[PDB]
Structure 1
Amino acid sequence: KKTKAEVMKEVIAKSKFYKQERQKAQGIMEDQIDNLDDNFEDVMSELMMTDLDKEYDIKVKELQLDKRAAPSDRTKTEEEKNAEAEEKKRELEQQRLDRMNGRTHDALLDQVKKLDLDDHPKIVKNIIKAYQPKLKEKLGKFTAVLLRHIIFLSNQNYLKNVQSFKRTQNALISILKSLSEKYNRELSEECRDYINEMQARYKKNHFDALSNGDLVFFSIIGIL
């Protein structure tokens, strides 16, 4: 009886609520049917038509004037910042253990760099990259240029000694580390195409397709 008379008291008062709701909807529908044009005749019959603004106008020039963004955030505790990184270090560690179970063309930029000098052309290119980034597809092309141009230079010369070559070389290493943490799909495409080309060259000529550039290719991808 309690599950019936409640169902009775509900739906009765629900339909009572529904009929009342439908009545107001019908009144609004009637308001849009005849009272709508009557309201148009209503407006044709009836008729009904500073200092802070100056301060606002003064603030209007105080809005297009000078500006400086420095909205800092909270303060990171030393242990707290240390722990999250330790957590971040750990998060890739078990993931490793779980893994232990399961600007465009080369010569377009090579001629640009050869005209320059590879002692700081990297830093110059880093600026050129940062410029583009300030404006990711071009960055992927840039990383492709970086890779094949590193291979190119290592193929080209060894006149720069261990204290003239390794400087810009490790600069390229750090640059490509950053661009690896930023971009990975393109890098994989680059390495895969290069290794297929490696095989093709080897197959055409076993020993006559060796490269120091290939050596440093292996080394850099291994430390990457």
Structure 2
Amino acid sequence: KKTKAEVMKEVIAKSKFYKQERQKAQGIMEDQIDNLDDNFEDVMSELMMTDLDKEYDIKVKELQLDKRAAPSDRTKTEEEKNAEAEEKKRELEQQRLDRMNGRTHDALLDQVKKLDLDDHPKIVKNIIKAYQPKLAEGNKEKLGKFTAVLLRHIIFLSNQNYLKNVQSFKRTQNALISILKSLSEKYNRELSEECRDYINEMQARYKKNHFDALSNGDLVFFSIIGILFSTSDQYHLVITPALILMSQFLEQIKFNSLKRIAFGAVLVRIVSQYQRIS
């Protein structure tokens, strides 16, 4: 009985509210239409036409003159930053554990930036990366293209002339692997396609020749992929076909000289360096 009473009361009250809203909308449409269509004669013949504002105009002049930006929009709290950095390191280690359980066409950087060998080249590449990120209006395509020619620059630079002495190529390759790992840690979308290009090139070359064109860039490719990625996880399209292809090199092609056995030995110790963390 209480259900029927409150139910009929609420239903009739909602219907009364809907009827009142419909009557108000009908009166709105009626008065507005029959007045806007009738006022076409009197919507033409009805005619009837300090220091704070001055200094506000001066302040707007100063505001359009001087313009700047805030640095990082937050606080650099040491304890909160250390807790988030510890949680980020734990997130990286736990992600590695959970995934281990689960117009630059190959000659642009040498044509433009590579002055002598390495020194002016990486600095001019930094100049290109600073000029492109400055005037990056809409930039995905050209960014991918000149990062591609950066990886091109190293894959036809790091093989011919390491003949200049030890500490020189040591410090230039150290600065290069540091800046390239720290730059390509946040992304994968072009290094992945360059790794597809490189596994295509080394597999095709290894089918093509016996040994006399096995380039010195394979060791640098294995070094840069081992630096830019932690090889601990299993399901990874990038690191594993190169490792089965170096195992294919070792099982198939012949090593009849001391530099060839040394090539096999440095590939064995770099797969040992991979399984140091794998």
TM-score by length of 2: 0.72
Provide Cα deviations, 1:49-87, integer angstroms capped at 9, x if missing partner.
243322222122212222333366554333322221111
Q: Is residue 2:216 matched to residue 1:212?
A: yes
State how far apart, in whole Å, the 1-side matches of 2:123 and 2:64 are.
36
Distance 1:116 1:61, change over 3 A: farther
Deviates more, 1:29-38 or 1:197-206: 29-38
Contact 1:132-1:139 within 8 A present in 2 as well: yes
Partner SS, residue 40 of structure 2: helix
Deviates more, 1:110-119 or 1:150-159: 110-119
Contact 1:151-1:213 within 8 A present in 2 as well: yes
Q: CA RMSD in A?
A: 2.4
Distance 1:179 1:142, change over 3 A: farther
Distance 1:196 1:72, change over 3 A: closer
Partner SS, residue 47 of structure 1: coil
Contact 1:103-1:109 within 8 A present in 2 as well: no
State how far apart, in whole Å, the 2-side matches of 1:45 and 1:61 are.
42
Deviates more, 1:30-39 or 1:88-97: 30-39
Provide Cα deviations, 1:22-57, integer angstroms capped at 9, x if missing partner.
111111211343111223334335443243322222
Contact 1:143-1:179 within 8 A present in 2 as well: no
Deviates more, 1:182-191 or 1:166-175: 166-175
State how far apart, in whole Å, the 2-side matches of 1:113 and 1:63 are.
41
Report the Cα offset of residue 211 of structure 1.
1.4
Report the Cα offset of residue 93 of structure 1.
0.9
Return 5+ residue gaps in structure 2 as ranges.
226-276
Report the Cα offset of residue 159 of structure 1.
3.1
Question: What percentage of aligned pairs have identical amino acids?
Answer: 100
State how far apart, in whole Å, the 1-side matches of 2:103 and 2:221 are.
20
Contact 1:113-1:121 within 8 A present in 2 as well: yes
Distance 1:63 1:11, change over 3 A: same
Distance 1:190 1:66, change over 3 A: same
Provide Cα deviations, 1:77-111, integer angstroms capped at 9, x if missing partner.
33322221111000111111111111712222212
Provide Cα deviations, 1:145-167, integer angstroms capped at 9, x if missing partner.
12221121122212322222122
Distance 1:140 1:129, change over 3 A: same
State how far apart, in whole Å, the 1-side matches of 2:178 and 2:103 are.
19
Deviates more, 1:191-200 or 1:26-35: 26-35
Return 5+ residue gaps in structure 1 as ranges.
none
TM-score by length of 1: 0.88
Match of 1:198 in 2: 202
State how far apart, in whole Å, the 2-side matches of 1:193 and 1:182 are.
21
Distance 1:214 1:116, change over 3 A: same
State how far apart, in whole Å, the 1-side matches of 2:212 and 2:31 are.
91
Contact 1:140-1:186 within 8 A present in 2 as well: yes
Contact 1:103-1:145 within 8 A present in 2 as well: no
Contact 2:148-2:194 within 8 A present in 1 as well: yes
Report the Cα offset of residue 116 of structure 1.
4.7
User: What number of residue pairs does the alignment pair up?
Assistant: 223
Report the Cα offset of residue 117 of structure 1.
4.3
Greater helix fraction, Structure 1 or Structure 2: 1
